Amino acid sequence: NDITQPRIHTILSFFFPFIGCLSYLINLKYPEPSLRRQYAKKALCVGSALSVIYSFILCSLLGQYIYQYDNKEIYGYTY
Amino acid sequence: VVPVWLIFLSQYCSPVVLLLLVAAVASLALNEVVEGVAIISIVTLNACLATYMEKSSGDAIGKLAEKLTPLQVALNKLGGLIGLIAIIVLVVIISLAVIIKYRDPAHADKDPTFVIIIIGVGFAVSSIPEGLPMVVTITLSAGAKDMVKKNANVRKLPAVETLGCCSVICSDKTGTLTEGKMTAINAVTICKNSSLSDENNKLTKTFDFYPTKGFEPCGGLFDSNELTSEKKKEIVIAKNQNTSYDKVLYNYGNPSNKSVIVDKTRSLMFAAYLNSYDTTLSRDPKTLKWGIHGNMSEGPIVVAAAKVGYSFINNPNHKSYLDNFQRLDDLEVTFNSSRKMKITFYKLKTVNVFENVYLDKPGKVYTHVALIKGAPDRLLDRSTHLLEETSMKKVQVSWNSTITQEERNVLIKKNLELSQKALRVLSICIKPLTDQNIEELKKLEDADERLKYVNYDENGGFIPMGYVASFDPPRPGVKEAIQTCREAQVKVIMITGDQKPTAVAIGKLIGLIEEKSEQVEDINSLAIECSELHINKNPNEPILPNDQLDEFTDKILIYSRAQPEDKITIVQSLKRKGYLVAMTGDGVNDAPALKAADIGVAMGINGTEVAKGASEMILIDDNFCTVVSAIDVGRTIFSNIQKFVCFLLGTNIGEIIYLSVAIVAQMPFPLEALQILFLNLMTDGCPAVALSREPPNDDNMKTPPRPKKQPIMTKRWWFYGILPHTIFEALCVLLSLAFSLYICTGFYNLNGIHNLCKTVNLVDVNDANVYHEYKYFCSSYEYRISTDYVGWVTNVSFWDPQNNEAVNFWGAAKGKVENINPLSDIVHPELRLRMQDGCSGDLTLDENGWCRPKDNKTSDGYNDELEGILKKGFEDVTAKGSKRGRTMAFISAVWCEMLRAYTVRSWEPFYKVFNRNMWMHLACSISATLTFLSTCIPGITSILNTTCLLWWQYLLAIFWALLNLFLDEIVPKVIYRRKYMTIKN
């Protein structure tokens, strides 16, 4: 019934998105109307959205700066 | 229980898993095992989740209330049919693609027939609903868990399925609809020639108890006609003070008010109390809450007595007063549903007086008294004499005159008025007796069954003194629950043992009978007594013919004067009429009725072991409203499976449609062999399985009950939901693939891409007129988005003369160029410098200066490092562009099928119900994250054959999926809303 630890998990999820989902996974036992489970739902939503966005950004950067440049091939304009 | 390993092994026997294992033969045949293994991975994951949920249902069921469910076997059959149809269609499409010499711009080193066969196998594995048994198991187990959470313990898994389709509820009034805490409300005193009476009848008068809160003993008796709410609330005020209600109004229950009327009321209450030796008032040991022990029906008499005295809490001397009246245990008549009265015998401490009411009879001394309590309808008819008030001195039994017909009607219409207002009435009678009368009663060979001597006598010794009316308060939520049932079009029938006017009154109070039904006689049209269920209108006749009973009782809503064994007839009639009967009972004699009912319901704590062993579910809540929530959850359990099957069909038909269109239109296949297996795993399993935990819709408790014969897919889910999503998804994915290939390689169809690569023919040496084929140059047009330049660029492949090997050159020239001439000024200076010195040795330079081998270059070593030639399997710019385009199409397909999960959930527009489920958020983001990561992880991309995209490429791939969210904001769910969700046009 403590609101502090799901909030801590929500904040910490900004540096590792899998933490937010773990937050909802761990305290599902608590009753739904409790503030702890509501903040756990918020943690899961934040973790999921940040997971999608972080995967997008990481993959885009990885492509544009590694996979765009195969070592052996040659590149000219706009490369 | 079934062994866990046996449960895990058994789930592979479902038809869809069997079909997937049939497709897994590719791992043993001459095919790619690295892609056929993933089918086993999907099957193993589904089996693991399903066996976990089945094992958990084995815990939530059985131990908490004490092989396939018909829905499960029907849905397994449906999944098998879907798999067979998909396999047949894909077989036709793949045979068409093989008869035509179809081939891909990539996969040049492999045989096209094997590639297209493996792609068809992957499409078959996707289109077969391999997750259907797993989702049905999860939905049923989670539904049972939800039922247990809502105080409804289901004993059998099939009970969860059958509850949603239930169309009638039969519940006992007492215990289920109304709480068993009966409290006294009025009491009527009967004495002719009395000085005080109601409406100047001079024979009867009514009295009212206050306060009337549950089983609380303190209070008194007052006059009904004078106690308004204003005078009642001031009596409630200062109730903590000692007994002083006389300051407000005359309290007839105060023993200090020794008057004739008070004497009669005391006599009636003392006669009532002596019949209640089986019950006693009590208080909780940890809370100042009153209570009652013993029979529930006898309870309110003791509480009523405590308000006029005759209780240990009022005076400790009451124990000796009761001890003065010894009891004759030999003649006691026990109460049961067949007799409907109970008789007790006691000895008096006097000669011919009882609570100042005189039983004087010449030549007889009445040392004993017989007290009777029971239903008025079985004691009033045999009444012989009443009490009479003589002058203003004493009340004596009127031995002088028998009860006339008008005198009987005096009691009759008062009983009629008191039985209304939802009050049940108990009539108390007496018979004076002597020692010789007790000896005669003991000499009777008959048991306590008849004891006819008490009721009938040649001297007419049978006196009813009055009535006691008690209210049976309805449970707090029963009215809302019945209103919800009416909105759900599930018929609600009350079965009760109370009298017929009482039954109709309590039904009207709790809302079974509306005031709008007064246009017809609700007294007889809906509420009937059980005596009417026989051809002759009396219980002696056994039964009434079925062909008339089924037609007579189809309008009836309330049954009165019922018996536990009669419930069987009601269940049979309703079952013959076509309803799915859920009947409630305690199990003493109605266990066969519960068993014969479609959904037996044990009455929780009050129910016996037989009821809990015969019923399909147990109401631990001890409340009727739980059955309504039970029907709601049962309906949600089928609705979630319906949504899941809609998702499956609407995505896995669109897959086949766009594959067929790609093959027909000579486009590259929109998905790889294992890309489609990854798509299947990332749109079923997650988030399609997350549809199993959807909360109830706003109209799932408003639609009529689903008939059992109704198919899972009504035509409403075909004209909208399935077909308009398959067509839209095919359009979106095909347009994404076409625009993707146009952006990435400059052409959108296989003919354009293949003609885009230049080939040369070399005549064989050992075989005359036989020609080998090679490629010596490739072009491509790729759209570019960058800070420096936005627009088309051209990329080429050629045999590099400086490095003497095939190389890939990107961005040779800005804008599309028909024939790239490296000696021109348009070409990038590096490419011009790399070949301006001329071709390397023995090579040709006539056609634009590219390095093509001369016509005499043939050797039997096909693709064996021949100079001037790109090797087979080398990734030309055409092949790389096609791979990038197929990656964008794959991501678009995943985000098009996954986003359907957000519009399947409810017919309401998705923006209102977005946050309604969290498991769908988890599964949707898992799918999205694994889609983005599968195209950038170096290990995964080497087997999925995907290449990592640019940021604007990812936005372009996703946007073709968000265009499929116009399935909600435009058409056709708006059409469905306007045609069915609109309350009125």
Side-chain angles (χ1 to χ4, degrees), chain A residues 21 25 28 41 44 48 51-52 55-56 59-60 63-64 67-68 70 72-79, chain B residues 782 784 789 805 808-811 814 828 834 880 918 922 925 929 932-933 936 938 948 950-951 954-955:
Chain A
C21 309
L25 285 168
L28 183 61
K41 288 186 178 186
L44 163 154
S48 63
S51 190
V52 178
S55 212
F56 168 85
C59 156
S60 163
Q64 164 84 90
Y67 286 103
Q68 183 54 109
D70 288 349
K72 195 72 181 43
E73 311 185 342
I74 318 176
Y75 308 90
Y77 284 52
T78 58
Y79 276 127
Chain B
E782 179 179 16
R784 271 285 144 152
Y789 162 26
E805 54 141 356
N808 284 321
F809 195 103
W810 289 88
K814 281 160 128 290
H828 183 306
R834 195 165 286 264
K880 197 108 63 182
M918 291 306 143
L922 174 63
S925 293
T929 294
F932 280 166
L933 287 186
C936 78
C948 178
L950 277 305
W951 68 268
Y954 275 114
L955 281 36

Side-chain angles (χ1 to χ4, degrees), chain B residues 398-447:
Chain B
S398 193
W399 301 118
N400 54 73
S401 58
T402 49
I403 293 163
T404 79
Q405 292 298 328
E406 308 93 353
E407 188 161 309
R408 191 76 64 74
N409 194 347
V410 168
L411 269 49
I412 285 172
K413 64 212 161 303
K414 277 297 171 188
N415 168 45
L416 176 59
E417 312 218 323
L418 261 305
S419 60
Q420 273 154 50
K421 318 172 185 180
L423 315 182
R424 129 180 283 192
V425 182
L426 296 168
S427 58
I428 299 100
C429 312
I430 199 171
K431 169 173 192 187
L433 299 169
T434 199
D435 298 344
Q436 280 81 13
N437 301 147
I438 300 307
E439 181 77 5
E440 286 162 344
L441 278 161
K442 289 193 189 196
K443 279 178 176 181
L444 295 177
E445 192 167 26
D446 301 336

Side-chain angles (χ1 to χ4, degrees), chain B residues 236-249:
Chain B
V236 186
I237 294 168
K239 64 187 293 290
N240 304 80
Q241 199 65 43
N242 67 297
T243 308
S244 53
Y245 307 118
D246 301 283
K247 297 302 185 73
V248 179
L249 278 177

